[PDB]
Structure 1
Amino acid sequence: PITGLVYDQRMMLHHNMWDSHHPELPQRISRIFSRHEELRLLSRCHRIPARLATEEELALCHSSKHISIIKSSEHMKPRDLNRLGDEYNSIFISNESYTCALLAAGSCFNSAQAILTGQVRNAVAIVRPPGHHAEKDTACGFCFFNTAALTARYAQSITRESLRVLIVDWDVHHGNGTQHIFEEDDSVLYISLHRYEDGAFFPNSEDANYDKVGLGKGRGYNVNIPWNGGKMGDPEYMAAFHHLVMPIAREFAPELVLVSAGFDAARGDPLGGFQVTPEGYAHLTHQLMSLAAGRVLIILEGGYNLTSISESMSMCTSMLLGDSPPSLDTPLKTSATVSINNVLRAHAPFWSSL
C-alpha cells in the first residue's frame, strides 16, 4: 500500500529572464517538496525518479512542428527566446525550458508506470512547467507540452490502447489543450471545473462552457463545469463532485485517474480569486481514490500562492497515504447551483447515473 512521489530540482531551471517575479516561479515545486519534509510525509512515500520524455513520446499528443520549435529554443539566444515566447499566448522561455518540460512529462510517465505495474498504489508528481493549456500544435498559458494528456496516452501505450483514463482538472483555469486533444475520444474522459465568467476568464474561450460535450465517438466524454459570479469554495466544489464528477466517473469506471491538480482555486491565490481550502482538496482527493481501485496520479498544474499550494498539495498526499479526511466547515452560492444544473442538462443524455 505504497504512495509514490516524484520531484526533481532540475525543473527549477526554467525561468523568466525579464521578470524574476513572474508568478510561475521555480520555487513553486521546491516549496511543495519542503512542506512534505516538514510534515514528515516524504519518508512515508516511495521516491520515483524523474526522466526525460522522448520525442516519440511527445508525438503521442503533439505535432512534429511544435516539438521541433520548442526543442530548438534550447539553443536560442535571448533575442530569439523573447521573440519566440511573445508569439504564443502567455509564454516565457529560457534555454532550460525544453528540458524542464521533458522532465515534467517523463516524471509523470514513470509515475503512471509505477502505478500500472503495481509498484505503488498511487502517486504525486511535483513538476513544472505546467501542461494543461498546451495544444497539439502550440504552447499556451505557461505550458509547453500537455503533461497530463501525454501521460494518459503513455498509460495506454504500456497497457492497452483503449485503457479508460479519467482526467479530473481542478485547476481554476480550463484545460483547453486537454479538452481539444481528447475531444473526439471516448477512451479518455475529461472533467474540468473552472472559473469561466461567461468567457472573460483565461483562457478566454467559450470552448470552456458546459455545452461542449465532445465530438463524434467522444460525445459525452467531455464535461465542463464552469463557474460564474465571483468567489467559489469548498461547498461549491463538494456539490459539483456529489452531483456531477463522481456519478459520471463511477459510470465511466476508469482504469486510471489522473488529476490535473492546479492549486490556483485555493484561498490566497493571487490569480484565481476562489477560496478552496486544503481540507477541501483533501476531500476531493479522498473521493477520487474510490475510483480505479485507487490508481490515482496527482499532477501539479497551476497554483501561485506558495504557502497555499504547499499546504494544499501536502494534504492531497496525506490522503493518498491513507490518512483520514479532515473536517470541513455554508449554503451554495446561487450561480453555482445554476452552473451544476446546466451541466446536468448537458450530460443527462449521456450518463444513466444522471
Structure 2
Amino acid sequence: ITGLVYDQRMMLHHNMWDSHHPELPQRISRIFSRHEELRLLSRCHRIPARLATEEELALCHSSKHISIIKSSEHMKPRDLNRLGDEYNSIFISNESYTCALLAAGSCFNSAQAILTGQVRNAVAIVRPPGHHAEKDTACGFCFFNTAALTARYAQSITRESLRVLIVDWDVHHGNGTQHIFEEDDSVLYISLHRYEDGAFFPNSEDANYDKVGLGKGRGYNVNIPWNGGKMGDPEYMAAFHHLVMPIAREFAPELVLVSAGFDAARGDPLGGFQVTPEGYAHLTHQLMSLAAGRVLIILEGGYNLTSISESMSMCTSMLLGDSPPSLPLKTSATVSINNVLRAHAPFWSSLR
C-alpha cells in the first residue's frame, strides 16, 4: 500500500505582489491532477493533512521564529511585504502560516502511517517547501523545515535513535536541513545540488563537499555539489551508484525521507538541469531497497508544472510497485564524485 497526502488548502499561500513568481499555488494541484490522469490516485491510500502544532514546530525551530511567522496571519499587505523582505527570498500572505503548518502536519501523518504499518511508503504533495528553512529563520520560499521536522517527529513517535536518511535531490542545497542535523549521527543528510562554486542559490560554501558534519555528526553530512555542467540522468545515476547507495546501505536507515524537489528536472526554468521522469523513477526505485521499503517522498521545489507533475507521478508509480522504465558522464561530474570520496572515505568503509 502506498499512501498519498494532498490538501488543497496549501494552494492558498501566494505572492500578492508578483503573480508570476514560480512558487505557484498550481504546483501541487497540477501534480495531483496528473496522479488522477495517470490513474495513480485510486491506487493509493489517501492520508489526511493536519496542522502541525507549535510544540511540534519546536522540534527544530525557535520559539521566536514560530511566533514571528504566526504573527503574519492577520497582517496588512504593507506589513506582509515588510516582514517577507526581512528574509532571503520569502513572500508571505495571510494564509502562508496555515499552509506551512499543513505541509509539516501532512508529512507527520504520512511518517506515522508508514511507521505504524498502515502503508509501506507514501508521497506528500505539499507546499510551501521547507529545506531552506533554518532553526531561527525563513529562507528561499521556506518557512519551516518540513523534512527536518518530519525526521524529528518520526523519532518522537518511535525512538530517538531511529536512523533517518534524508536524501535531498532538489537542485538546491538544503542549508536548513544540513545545519539542523549538522552535529547529529542519528540523521544522515545526503544532498545533491548544483553548486557552481557558490554562484547557485543559496550561495553558501556550506554546500561544498568538504562540509562533512561536526562533532559526533562528523561523517553524517554528505554534500554532492555539481559544477560546470548540465547534469542529468547519467550523473545522478553515477552519484547514486558510487556515493548515495553505498553510504546509505552502510548507514542502514530505518526511514528514508526524500526532500524531493523536482527543479533538477528537464525543463525547469530555475535549475537548468535535465533529469528525466524516468531518471527520477530509477532514483526512487533504488531508494526503495532501503529501510524495508519505507520511503516518504516530500515535495520541495520544482517549478516547471509539466515536469514536476510527470516526475513526481513517476516516483509514485515506483512506490506502487510498477516496473522501472527503460533509460559518458560530464567530466566535472567525475571530479565532483571523486571530491566527495576524498572527504568521506575516512567515515564510510563502503567507499573503499
TM-score interval w.r.t. the shorter chain? over 0.9
Which residue is equivalent to 1:99?
98
SS at match of 2:190: strand
| Aligned pairs for 1:104-123 within 5 A | 104-123=103-122
Cα offsets for 1:4-58 (capped at 9, x unmatched): 0000000000000001111000000000000000000000000000000000000
User: What is the distance in 2 between the residues matched to 1:161 and 1:269?
Assistant: 38
User: What is the distance in 2 between the residues matched to 1:306 and 1:348?
Assistant: 39
User: What is the distance in 2 between the residues matched to 1:341 and 1:271?
Assistant: 26
User: What is the distance in 1 between the residues matched to 2:118 and 2:278?
Assistant: 28
Percent identity for Structure 1 against Structure 2: 100
Judge conservation of contact 2:229–2:330 (CA < 8 Å) in 1: no
User: What is the distance in 1 between the residues matched to 2:76 and 2:97?
Assistant: 14
User: What is the distance in 2 between the residues matched to 1:341 and 1:203?
Assistant: 23
Taking structure 1 as the reference length, the TM-score comes to 0.99
What is the deviation of 1:75? 1.2
Judge conservation of contact 1:286–1:319 (CA < 8 Å) in 2: yes
User: What is the distance in 1 between the residues matched to 2:37 and 2:162?
Assistant: 37
User: What is the distance in 2 between the residues matched to 1:201 and 1:57?
Assistant: 32
Which residue is equivalent to 1:78?
77
What is the deviation of 1:162? 1.0
What is the deviation of 1:281? 0.1
User: What is the distance in 1 between the residues matched to 2:119 and 2:79?
Assistant: 43
User: What is the distance in 2 between the residues matched to 1:346 and 1:118?
Assistant: 37
User: What is the distance in 2 between the residues matched to 1:13 and 1:317?
Assistant: 24
| Aligned pairs for 1:1-354 within 5 A | 2-328=1-327, 331-354=328-351
User: What is the distance in 2 between the residues matched to 1:191 and 1:230?
Assistant: 20
SS at match of 2:141: coil
Cα offsets for 1:219-254 (capped at 9, x unmatched): 000000000003000000000000000000000000
Taking structure 2 as the reference length, the TM-score comes to 1.00
User: What is the distance in 1 between the residues matched to 2:338 and 2:326?
Assistant: 27
What's the Cα RMSD here? 0.3
SS at match of 2:138: coil
User: What is the distance in 1 between the residues matched to 2:256 and 2:308?
Assistant: 21
Judge conservation of contact 1:255–1:292 (CA < 8 Å) in 2: yes
Judge conservation of contact 1:191–1:224 (CA < 8 Å) in 2: yes
User: What is the distance in 1 between the residues matched to 2:195 and 2:231?
Assistant: 12
Contiguous gaps of at least 5 residues in structure 1: none
User: What is the distance in 1 between the residues matched to 2:83 and 2:229?
Assistant: 35
What is the deviation of 1:126? 0.1
Judge conservation of contact 2:108–2:150 (CA < 8 Å) in 1: yes
Contiguous gaps of at least 5 residues in structure 2: none
Judge conservation of contact 1:184–1:215 (CA < 8 Å) in 2: yes
Judge conservation of contact 2:276–2:311 (CA < 8 Å) in 1: yes
Cα offsets for 1:262-307 (capped at 9, x unmatched): 0000000000000000000000000000000001000000000000
Judge conservation of contact 2:3–2:122 (CA < 8 Å) in 1: yes
Judge conservation of contact 1:230–1:273 (CA < 8 Å) in 2: no
